[PDB]
Amino acid sequence: MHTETFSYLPPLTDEEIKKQVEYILKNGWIPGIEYTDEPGPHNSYWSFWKLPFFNAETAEEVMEELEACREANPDCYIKITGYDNIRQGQVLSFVAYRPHHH
Amino acid sequence: MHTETFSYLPPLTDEEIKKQVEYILKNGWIPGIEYTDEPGPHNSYWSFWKLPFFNAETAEEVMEELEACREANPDCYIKITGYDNIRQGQVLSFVAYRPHHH
Amino acid sequence: MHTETFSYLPPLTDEEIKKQVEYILKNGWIPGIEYTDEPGPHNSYWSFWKLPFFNAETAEEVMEELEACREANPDCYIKITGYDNIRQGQVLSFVAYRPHHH
Amino acid sequence: MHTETFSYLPPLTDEEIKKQVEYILKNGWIPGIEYTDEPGPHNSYWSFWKLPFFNAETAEEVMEELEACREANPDCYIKITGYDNIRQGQVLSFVAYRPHHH
Amino acid sequence: AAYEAGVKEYRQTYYDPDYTPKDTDILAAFRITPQPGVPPEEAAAAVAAESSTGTWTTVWSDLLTDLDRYKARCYRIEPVPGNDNQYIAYIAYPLDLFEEGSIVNLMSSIVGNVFGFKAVRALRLEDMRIPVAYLKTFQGPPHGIQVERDRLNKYGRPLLGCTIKPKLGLSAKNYGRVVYECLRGGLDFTKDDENINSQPFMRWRDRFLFVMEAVHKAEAETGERKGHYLNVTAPTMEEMYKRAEFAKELGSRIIMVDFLTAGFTAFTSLSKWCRENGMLLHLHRAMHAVIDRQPNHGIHFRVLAKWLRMVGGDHIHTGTVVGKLEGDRASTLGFVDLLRENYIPADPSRGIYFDQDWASMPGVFPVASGGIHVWHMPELVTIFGDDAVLQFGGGTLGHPWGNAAGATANRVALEAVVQARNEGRDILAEGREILKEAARWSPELRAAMETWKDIKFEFETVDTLDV
Amino acid sequence: AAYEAGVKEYRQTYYDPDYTPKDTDILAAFRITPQPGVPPEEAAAAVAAESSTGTWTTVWSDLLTDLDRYKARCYRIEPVPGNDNQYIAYIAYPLDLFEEGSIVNLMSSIVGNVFGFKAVRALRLEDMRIPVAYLKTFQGPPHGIQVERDRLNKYGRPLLGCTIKPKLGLSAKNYGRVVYECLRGGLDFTKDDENINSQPFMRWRDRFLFVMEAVHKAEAETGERKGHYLNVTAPTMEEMYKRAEFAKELGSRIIMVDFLTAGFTAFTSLSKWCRENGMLLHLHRAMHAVIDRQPNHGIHFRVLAKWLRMVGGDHIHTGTVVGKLEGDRASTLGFVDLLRENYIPADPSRGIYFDQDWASMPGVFPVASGGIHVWHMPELVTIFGDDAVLQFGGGTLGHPWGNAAGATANRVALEAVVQARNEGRDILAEGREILKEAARWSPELRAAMETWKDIKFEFETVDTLDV
Amino acid sequence: GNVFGFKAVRALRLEDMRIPVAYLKTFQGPPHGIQVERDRLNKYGRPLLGCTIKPKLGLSAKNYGRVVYECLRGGLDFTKDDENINSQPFMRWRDRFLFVMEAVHKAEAETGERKGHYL
């Protein structure tokens, strides 16, 4: 089960994940977190963890929510998203955490 | 060239025509006069001589208009009509005068 | 698995269920009991417990039937229905008992 | 055979025709002359007498052309036209001369 | 003289105060404001004449037919309470003036030209008596309330919907996301905004695809049947059919149309299509207030309500009374009955001028929508009862925690109110306490109540009944 | 808090008095009457918001899109001369809010819900600026004035028509008779009444058959091209197409539709069909005065005129000014220009709020109809000029000698007036003398003039411009 | 549907029915009806005259056309197929329609009166 962008790289470390979040914020885009236990090609709509973080100012805020999502959903795939309302679409979506049964 | 009702009888005399007009008036129907030089099966609308005689009270009034129509259109077929606005349709239509070239 | 009306409230107590039965009877409607092990959105026809209780006069009668249905079908969902033959349709349907595996 | 504009008026005198030509020129429109022996409703294209008189400066010029057309085509209907290239369409068309067999 | 040419007064032929209407006559009640100097019965006779058989001068061709049998007749004129310049004119139209099954034809007579006459300063069609013999020429609702509840397997409460917001500007995939969140949180329905058709920011086929993925996902996740009213309002009938067919292809149970902006010819075609294809039809009344807002001129909504029930829809917007758009309580209760019941007696206190029989034509779900939120739930359930759709657009997507939470808040509020009603509580007197009870165990409802506490819409009503 | 939930004032987001409209924006001018206590710019901002992107409370989903680029903006609010409670609000809408080629969509936004808000006591859409970039998404008239004149081979005078009477109750064969008499006497056109569709007293196929026999007979007898506007107004699109197709099969050059009662979806389909089938399309505006009569609420006809030219017709009724139906002279001259010209500058004295460019879209024939007779001919030719259809229903069939005489009287009156105008005479000052000149040699005109001498329609105008 | 066959009822005749206007309005009624038909035929003031072709069965298409021509040209308004003339080995229906309509149009042109054969 590949999960699109960065799925062909080794799993990202927390510091590598944070650098992707910093890229989202640096470009003025909105970071978000999504998760699911049904990751296949049929599923356009992973579960939102809260809402996209319109008010997030730092990458650390987002990493803290990622850890919370993982703690609450350790059996799920968890992705980081970046969103641009001007083009109106996601500019980046990648899996940050895979469950043990991957 | 047959002309529908009474066309298979000998031409009607003026007195026979007048009796048909009296039948129209007796039944509360409206007498009228139509004429044409194009009498065939393609023609639903012979020329009106004036309008249907909504105000006619006697058969003689109608016979006088018939003579006037003939005098003015001696080359035409001329029919007497009777009209009922309740059923909304003609109750009688027959040729009273045929031109010499018949 | 949500079960339509009252599914977003806490599970009803027997006392709260009986008040709904009284509401059905008070309005001249016919109480009934239905049950199934297949409660999803594909199933329009849960099993009838007996027939709609056309002759029921008291809510206690219905609660007794409800307990009997539960004892006989403890692994099933059980709903109370209220039925109006004048409009010809159910006026109320809600789940009174959910099985342990819910 | 009615011939569209002014056909329900008495035939125009030469003086009345010239006033219409003056109306055409006064408004900056182009006078023309058309003629035919086939005036019915099937015929969109009467014969041109020469070309539309793009260079005409006086109504008398046009009346002279009208007389010349009539002399050459006494058995034809002859119309005066007024033409506007800005709207791209004729602004006036009327029969000035009808043949003896009319 | 063959006949009497020239101008007569309309009242000589078209005012008959001793006429007794037949049970097959179409009746109209017009609020008429004559010009000064025009007798009220002449103005009323002008309306009767120029909506049936007459024009402005005598024509001989009247004598070709039986004018007595075809003319409309003003059979009653009455003053208006509190206005010495307005009258109610009652006009009777023979049944065979009207094309069978054609509201388009009915309108072309009843409201075709008569609102523009110089002799009439203002004209409002207040009510019509549609006889059973004419009703039987119409399909009526594609399904109607009882069939719809059976098709949805939903009994015992109002249904809950929600217009997606912002009105315009969302992409197709974002539309699907917000729909999924709304439906999965407990709403029965979501919908396109009335002005969401097909646009550069979101083309309709893209929208239908992503929305129906969301609908089916929410239905499987919750276990309750869901629907999104996909809007088939379109420039041409051909486009409208294409959009209806794709909704069906994707498995939608329901579509919507803006029946007035699309118009009654396309509406009648679509209603027949919905019957033939088993599709629920939600009617949005966009543009109605252009016509029905002012008490002195236009057409009251209760007339439009009869016409649209005849052509047929399964839902129709009827107002909220308490929300952001105007809806006079008494009149609204009146035309809700006109839309749902089989027999409605005349009732001056609710603006019902005529007894109306529906000869078993199914009822239409009223839809209460526009500027309502959780605190309105007790009164909404009181006003409309179980057979209504209550829609919360801003009242769902404006929840501080997002759509799923907003949907849960509205669903919890509704069920708590319905439960309390069924238990015998006075939900109007206890409405706030009932909501607070449920907020003790529903944090979603608690937050919704905090968000909109003391938000109310209370204004002087423009379209009121006569005093 | 993820975002700022709760209710804001609309003017915080939707009132921008420093916005400069783009040449691609759709502009609207609304006459708005706020409730007391509602700031005028808040009422105007509510209209802008609820006809574009906004609702009654803040929604997080705004942040998914670029609201700044999609929102409508009220960019100007001005007081109304002589009314301290009305304002003109100017609102600008981005081009990509609108479905291409869809007046239905445009209406669903601009006039969809905003006329019913409690905060707004009354609302009238007075004008719209339709940008060229949106106009190019529409077909426009199937043919338009120049093509129609070329297709009819008629140049240099107004065209003449006539509504058959009595409105309802005639049989098919009688309809053909009266049509034959009218056309053979000199009228270019006759027409079904707007409410003649298909009825028990006369079914449409029977009518079309007998009428077209009459049309072809009159055309052959007179030598001039004739037409009868066969009415295809129908309950369903399927019936409408059937009737249009049979008109074509029988060789009619022209049909009519009641474009408002049928509605804009069916109208748009029919206009496309008329283009594809070479059929002239006469538009009857039945129901318009329900919407456009009152100066305080509704939609002014000049807006409807733009919309119908965009969708496309070849003729449209525009009023008479002097006849039985109301038509303010100044406003009428204004929207006649809006219907015929390629560029119309703003003109407050004629109610034209915006410059309007038509980017070569053909013009539509205005049709003056309703309560006019021969004595009106001088002024009608003066008001409208050559490019108009003047229709005399009662003014033909009410001639004391019948239809052919009535038709000849109107044709003679018209040609005498046109001749006199072209000769340089002042036809307004000399109008009565011109008619009397022609009556000396036309007994038909003489009798028509005797019949309607001193019949006039002069009333105080309800829908007037501001003073 | 079933009530004429019950054991408990020896005989049953439906004599009349009152059809209410509200049910009648759900029906088309005659395609044209008497008034419209008279206008379509341009015939007023007398009953119309028709005629069933005979022998009932056994005539060929061309012979059918001949007898129709002779009937109509002599003053009848109508002729008709017998009720049991449909399509058969002795005369197939398209052949019949072809020859009959040649005869109808010929008789109409010859007499000047509108004719019809009920095919």
Ligand SMILES: O=C(O)[C@@](O)(COP(=O)(O)O)[C@H](O)[C@H](O)COP(=O)(O)O
């Ligand atoms: O566009 C709107 O305003 C709505 O989507 C409501 O939005 P909210 O739920 O966010 O208010 C509805 O279309 C209106 O209720 C229609 O008015 P009516 O029902 O009176 O026809």
Ligand SMILES: O=C(O)[C@@](O)(COP(=O)(O)O)[C@H](O)[C@H](O)COP(=O)(O)O
């Ligand atoms: O029904 C009628 O009254 C007419 O047939 C006119 O009859 P007359 O010619 O006998 O008056 C036209 O439809 C109106 O002019 C329409 O009004 P408008 O043109 O203002 O839309």
Ligand SMILES: [Mg+2]
């Ligand atoms: Mg909406």
Ligand SMILES: [Mg+2]
């Ligand atoms: Mg009319």
Ligand SMILES: [Mg+2]
């Ligand atoms: Mg037989």
